[PDB]
């Protein structure tokens, strides 16, 4: 309070005062003061948030705000502030890899963005991914790419015993939206009508839940679909996409250049017929 009342220093004294409140808030409690002054940090960070030291300490106080539980789903943005804050490793890998361990765990505990393998060509996590247990990353990939291999999506219960049954039905919802990206992403173009066996097979669920599934996807608002279940065979609209792979870059080049040079070539053919009447 002394070095806040007498210090109005020009190299951003107010935010270092608020991070002093944050860094010694570790003993005063973290529920009476977190909202007020931790939110007041980014209220006062309205000039130019480019210090990266106040942003890392800002992650530290917002992650203590994640500890004192408010908005599990905000941990993905809090990861976009820590993962966002650090660029070069600047702290030992022998603690970073366990931070990536608990980062994957706590990003799993907050389920708002449900595509947590979104950015995993990120260096100061992937250099931990290839040094941590190699299957936790593959079960984040079993929540990213494909919703099958009960080895993976149950090995996340084998290795990680606690804090999975408290989110198990919601993780089933996550694999039941992973089928929703699969069926129009990987499969040939759409099939225009997709059977209950397909959603229930990728979903490892019964027939009488894919209805609740597609309505729940409408409640989420990632698909605008028409619920075709006169045949239990579902019709497709636009979906929020998932990460384009390298082989999917290549297959995208394939079907995309298919479109490109076919429309261009048959366009030149139409114009070759339309060429005679210019004058």
């Amino acid at each position: 309070e002394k070095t806040r009342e007498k210090v109005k220093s020009s190299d951003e004294a107010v935010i270092l005062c608020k991070t002093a409140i944050g860094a010694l808030k570790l003993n005063i409690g973290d529920l009476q003061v977190t909202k007020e002054t931790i939110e007041d940090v980014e209220e006062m960070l309205n000039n130019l948030p480019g210090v990266t030291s106040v942003h890392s300490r800002f992650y530290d106080l917002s992650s203590k705000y994640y500890q004192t539980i408010g908005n599990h789903a905000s941990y993905y943005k809090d990861a976009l502030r820590f993962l966002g804050c650090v660029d070069i490793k600047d702290l030992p890998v022998s603690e970073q890899q366990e931070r990536a361990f608990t980062l994957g765990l706590a990003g799993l505990l907050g389920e708002g963005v449900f595509n947590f393998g979104e950015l995993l060509m990120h260096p100061v996590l992937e250099s931990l991914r290839n040094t941590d247990r190699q299957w936790l990353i593959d079960t984040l990939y079993a929540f990213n790419s494909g919703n099958v291999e009960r080895f993976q999506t149950l090995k996340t219960a084998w290795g990680q015993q606690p804090d999975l049954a408290a989110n198990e039905a919601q993780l089933l919802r996550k694999i039941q939206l992973l089928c929703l990206m699969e069926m129009t992403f990987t499969r040939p173009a759409n099939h225009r009508q997709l059977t209950f066996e397909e959603i229930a097979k990728s979903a490892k669920i019964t027939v009488n839940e894919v209805e609740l599934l597609v309505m729940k996807a409408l409640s989420v608002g990632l698909v605008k679909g028409s619920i075709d279940e006169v045949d239990k065979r579902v019709h497709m609209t636009w979906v929020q996409p998932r990460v384009l792979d390298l082989q999917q870059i290549k297959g995208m080049k394939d079907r995309l250049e298919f479109w490109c040079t076919d429309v261009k070539s048959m366009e030149m053919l139409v114009e070759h017929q339309a060429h005679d009447i210019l004058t």
Partner: protein, 95 residues
């Protein structure tokens, strides 16, 4: 553009806090509309870098004003007005 242009932009964003540039071409042949707009805001990054101050491509056009073409369409003199019914559609097709 080149890397000095951000220094130009932020050095003249002090009079008014926005300073939109205009790319043009004195010898244009292949482009569409010469007029271009950027703006210098931040998304900061997915990796949240120290101030990734990016030009952001704002949409653009050629404007319009009544009776500013008095010189123009008298000068150019070559305009075939209202070619609807002939070959404008196939020029748009080719291009």
């Amino acid at each position: 553009l080149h890397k000095n242009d951000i220094a130009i932009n932020e050095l003249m964003k002090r009079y008014c806090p926005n300073s939109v540039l205009v790319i043009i071409d004195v010898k244009p042949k292949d482009l569409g509309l010469p007029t271009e707009a950027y703006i210098s805001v931040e998304e900061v990054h997915d990796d949240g870098t120290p101030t990734s101050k990016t030009f952001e491509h704002v949409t653009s056009e050629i404007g319009a004003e009544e009776a500013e073409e008095v010189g123009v369409e008298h000068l150019l003199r070559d305009i075939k007005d209202t070619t609807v019914g002939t070959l404008s559609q196939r020029i748009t097709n080719q291009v």
